[PDB]
Design a protein around this nucleic acid. Structure first.
Ligand SMILES: [Mg+2]
Ligand SMILES: [Mg+2]
Ligand SMILES: [Mg+2]
Ligand SMILES: [Mg+2]
Ligand SMILES: [Mg+2]
Ligand SMILES: [Mg+2]
Ligand SMILES: [Mg+2]
Ligand SMILES: [Mg+2]
Ligand SMILES: [Mg+2]
Ligand SMILES: [Mg+2]
Ligand SMILES: [Mg+2]
Ligand SMILES: [Mg+2]
Ligand SMILES: [Mg+2]
Ligand SMILES: [Mg+2]
Ligand SMILES: [Mg+2]
Ligand SMILES: [Mg+2]
Ligand SMILES: [Mg+2]
Ligand SMILES: [Mg+2]
Ligand SMILES: [Mg+2]
Ligand SMILES: [Mg+2]
Ligand SMILES: [Mg+2]
Ligand SMILES: [Mg+2]
Ligand SMILES: [Mg+2]
Ligand SMILES: [Mg+2]
Ligand SMILES: [Mg+2]
Ligand SMILES: [Mg+2]
Ligand SMILES: [Mg+2]
Ligand SMILES: [Mg+2]
Lengths: 96, 57, 107, 223, 67
RNA sequence: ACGGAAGGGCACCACCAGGAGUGGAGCCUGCGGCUUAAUUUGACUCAACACGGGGAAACUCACCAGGUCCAGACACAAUAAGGAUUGACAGAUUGAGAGCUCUUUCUUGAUUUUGUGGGUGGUGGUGCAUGGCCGUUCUUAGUUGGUGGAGUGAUUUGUCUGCUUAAUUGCGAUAACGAACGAGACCUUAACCUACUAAAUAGUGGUGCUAGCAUUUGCUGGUUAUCCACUUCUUAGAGGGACUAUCGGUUUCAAGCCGAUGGAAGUUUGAGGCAAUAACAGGUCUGUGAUGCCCUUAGACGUUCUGGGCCGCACGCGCGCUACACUGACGGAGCCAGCGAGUCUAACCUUGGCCGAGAGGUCUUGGUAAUCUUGUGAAACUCCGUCGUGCUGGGGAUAGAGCAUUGUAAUUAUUGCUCUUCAACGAGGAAUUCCUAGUAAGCGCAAGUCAUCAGCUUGCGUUGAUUACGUCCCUGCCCUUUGUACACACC
């Protein structure tokens, strides 16, 4: 799709920081809860990011549920430059 | 499937349930990476990371 | 040293009378078995929700209809206990299916 | 907040329905078999009745993490306020659902139609069922649709006991030619019922007397 | 119509077959018997049963009944 | 399985004895037809036609007249940092304050572009490729196995002349005995509990406080807590109750059926929910991010935006609504229901107070509700009048002028009110539907839809009949018997 690198990074960042993403199937939502960009930006960014492996997509009652893979983790590892043993939400919180 | 082979269904179908009690009886005993991301954008938050000067006329 | 008469009303609302009557008398006798002052389970009109629809996905056929319904049961019990037994009575006595709502106040 | 118990109690049903939906997709290959969500002081507890919780959990506890996060993000729960717990289920032999997606993941696994279903019926019966029934509607290898019944032992079809004793589930298996309908019926032995009536309303047992040795002229005992 | 089903008359039969000492021409007490003396499942079907074990009990007094 | 063979049955989707009608009229509404830029489409005997919850002003939306966008993943190639690509002010252009496009010349920074391959969306096709769901057969009573009897065998007997039942419901007959699915049981609802547990979100009596009338004590109110007490009414928990009981007639003195007495209740107690095996090329790809394959895929069958259209009117058909009056219209006046529903990250149900003939407005207010709207003071209906049989004061179609409400938008007139205009229709041919007791018919309500709109539907309660309580004549279907050269089963 056609989108500024700003809005690009914000997603990709968010995906690494979280590992998981959700987004109702609506386009023209201007900005969606959490990630500060166009809703349409989220979905077609992920969807791209998916069809190259990297992330699992799921649908159900109008909402898109995104799972990052492992090979994707390595890819976000690149696009953000960050070193191995970085993050993802693959930690077990405090003692939670 | 034709009824000309239906004996060999029930048999092969039985053994399927045989192995499905094997797997479920064998399942009646059977047999770090730190840093984070909001803590590394605040860790590598020390400067030397930009530049700013302009505006004239 | 704490405690004081706090004048309490517990609404109990659910859709499964067995659990709901369970939790209702269970609360009424457990809190009574240690002596209080109350108005026992006040059953309000079991009200019923209705959805009335055609069976057919499309339009064809004789016009069979088929109303579903959902039974909502709600109950309140008026208590007067002190702070301790209150929160003792609310945190536990829980039940997967019975909405507990414990308010306060004479207003 | 601030709802009405009318719009509330319905809404909660929707929440269940949508949750159960999203799980039934995201956790097939793990024999997802239903949820139940506990509404507590502090938390909201969700119990994931799947047969295979090792693959619900994942490496040192991920996946269920992903799943929470998902479930979390969507309904706008704050971290902590929602919590998921996976739980294996006491025999899959009497869960209609368990056997449905068994078959999907049996036929789809390149396997006979007779072998698949017939095996399924036998495992369910060996699992201590009172009776079982399986139906394959759809089109298979030839282009006119046909439909087979597979059913062993005892099942009832009418009245209230329906609700109590038989467990129904359809599943849509999506193959190369077209899609089939897997449809399962498991009937649990009523004598085991635990929470309910332990017999059909047809059940009317006569208890058996005793061999009396009568006569013996009067006489009385003293104490 | 009110033709009693087989389960009714079937149970009725074998109740009268082994408990003629006990039982009467009184439905009321033949009823109370069925609680103790058998396991039914329904309040309804139990009367519907006891009622007809009472009918038979009644006519037997005036000659045999087959079965 | 079928038959344009015979024999038995079953049913107000059959008739009988009747009722209320439709068929005639005006309009409402669906279908055909025609017309049209388009008048989107499915469906056509019961089992298409107030059906797709289909009451379309935009949306919906599929149609038509035109205008934007890619939301064309990913892979390779091509281009290319000297710029692969993005955007626009004014102007022209345009329905348009769309940089659509062009003039002009800044901006942008590898996110795209061009090429193939590969996807993708699609209310595009196919319901004669399917799932799922549903309708129909079915207002039906059918289906199967154990041990035994027959048959080389498929098979059969059980599962049957009869009688009985709503029922393969039973009794009885009996090479069968004894059973299971389905029917029944069951579950929900409406009925009965001065028995049980209670209640300022339900109501009663007493007592305070208090108004009126009478006075002799009384009578009718007020008073969400001023207190005391109770659960008859109301509410919902647990129990109970009916089993066609008692007795009598009738019957193979069998199942049963009928009658009287009792009873809350005695038509499966009344009404539903569920409902075996099997069939259909029933319907639905236009509910589905259910799906095969076909088709298209940037001048798009994608999508959005602007406007029109689905309502278009010589006419054929169907469900309805309002009527033709005096068992009435009108006008005051009495004044009585039950199922429902309602506002949070909000503008729902609305009491009350003013203003206005009205529709409505405006100020407030209660309610997330047994607490407030609401006792939903609803409608028929009951009463005292005015009209007097005259297309009349029955009837209110068509039409004019005005004021309001919903909505971004009301013209092809969304609805509401007022004045006026005052049609057809004098009980409706051949035909044909629905119906057996709180039912029919009359009557209004609430809920679905819903911004606004019900002449529809789903339930609800109010007033409350006549005539059956039978048959097999018509119709419809079931069961035997029988024929068959059918078995893809008379399409
Ligand atoms: Mg049954
Ligand atoms: Mg039944
Ligand atoms: Mg007649
Ligand atoms: Mg007539
Ligand atoms: Mg119709
Ligand atoms: Mg349009
Ligand atoms: Mg391309
Ligand atoms: Mg191509
Ligand atoms: Mg589609
Ligand atoms: Mg079809
Ligand atoms: Mg179909
Ligand atoms: Mg067609
Ligand atoms: Mg009838
Ligand atoms: Mg033999
Ligand atoms: Mg036969
Ligand atoms: Mg009472
Ligand atoms: Mg009487
Ligand atoms: Mg066809
Ligand atoms: Mg469909
Ligand atoms: Mg139309
Ligand atoms: Mg009047
Ligand atoms: Mg005025
Ligand atoms: Mg308020
Ligand atoms: Mg008039
Ligand atoms: Mg006139
Ligand atoms: Mg309305
Ligand atoms: Mg309609
Ligand atoms: Mg023959």
């Amino acid at each position: 799709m056609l989108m500024p690198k700003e809005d690009r990074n914000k997603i990709h960042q968010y995906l690494f920081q979280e590992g998981v993403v959700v987004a109702k199937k609506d386009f023209n939502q201007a900005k969606h809860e959490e990630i500060d960009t166009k809703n349409l930006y989220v979905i077609k960014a992920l969807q791209s990011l998916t069809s190259k492996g990297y992330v699992k997509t799921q649908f159900s009652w109008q909402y898109y549920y995104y799972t990052l893979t492992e090979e994707g983790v390595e890819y976000l590892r690149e696009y953000l430059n960050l070193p191995e043993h970085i993050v993802p939400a693959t930690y077990i919180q405090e003692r939670n | 499937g034709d009824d000309k082979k239906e004996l060999s269904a029930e048999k092969e179908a039985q053994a399927d349930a045989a192995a499905e009690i094997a797997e479920d009886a064998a399942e009646a005993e059977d047999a770090l990476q730190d840093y984070l991301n909001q803590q590394a954008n605040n860790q590598f938050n020390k400067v030397p990371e930009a530049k700013k000067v302009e505006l004239d006329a | 040293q704490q405690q004081q008469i706090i004048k309490i009303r517990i609404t109990l609302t659910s859709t499964k009378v067995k659990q709901l009557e369970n939790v209702s008398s269970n609360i009424v006798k457990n809190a009574e078995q240690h002596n209080l002052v109350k108005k026992g389970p006040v059953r309000l009109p079991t009200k019923v929700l209705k959805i009335s629809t055609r069976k057919t996905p499309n339009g064809e056929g004789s016009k069979t209809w088929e109303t579903y319904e959902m039974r909502i049961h709600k109950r309140y019990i008026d208590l007067e206990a002190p702070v301790q037994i209150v929160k003792r009575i609310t945190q536990i006595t829980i039940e997967p299916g019975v909405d507990v709502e414990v308010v306060v106040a004479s207003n | 907040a601030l709802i009405s118990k009318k719009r509330k109690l319905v809404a909660d049903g929707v929440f269940y329905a949508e949750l159960n939906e999203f799980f039934t997709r995201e956790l097939a290959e793990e024999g997802y078999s239903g949820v139940e969500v506990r509404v507590t002081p502090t938390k909201t507890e969700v119990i994931i009745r799947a047969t295979r919780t090792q693959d619900v959990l994942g490496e040192n506890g991920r996946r269920i993490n992903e799943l929470t996060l998902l479930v979390q993000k969507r309904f706008k729960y704050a971290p902590g306020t929602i919590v998921l717990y996976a739980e294996r289920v006491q025999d899959r032999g009497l869960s209609a659902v368990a056997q449905a997606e068994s078959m999907k993941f049996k036929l789809l696994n390149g396997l006979a139609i007779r072998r698949a279903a017939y095996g399924v019926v036998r495992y369910v019966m060996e699992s201590g069922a009172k009776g079982c029934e399986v139906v394959v509607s759809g089109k298979l290898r030839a282009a006119r649709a046909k439909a087979m019944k597979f059913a062993d032992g005892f099942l009832i079809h009418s009245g209230q006991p329906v609700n109590d004793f038989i467990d129904t589930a359809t599943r849509h298996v999506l193959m190369r030619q077209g899609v089939l309908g897997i449809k399962v019926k498991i009937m649990r032995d009523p004598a085991k019922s635990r929470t309910g009536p332990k017999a059909l309303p047809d059940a009317v047992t006569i208890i058996e007397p005793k061999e009396e040795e009568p006569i013996l002229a009067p006489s009385v005992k003293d104490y | 119509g009110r033709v009693r089903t087989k389960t009714v008359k079937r149970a009725s039969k074998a109740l009268i077959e082994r408990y003629y000492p006990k039982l009467t021409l009184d439905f009321q007490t033949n009823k109370r018997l069925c609680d103790e003396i058998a396991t039914i499942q329904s309040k309804r079907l139990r009367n519907k049963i006891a009622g007809y074990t009472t009918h038979l009990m009644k006519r037997i007094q005036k000659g045999p009944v087959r079965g």
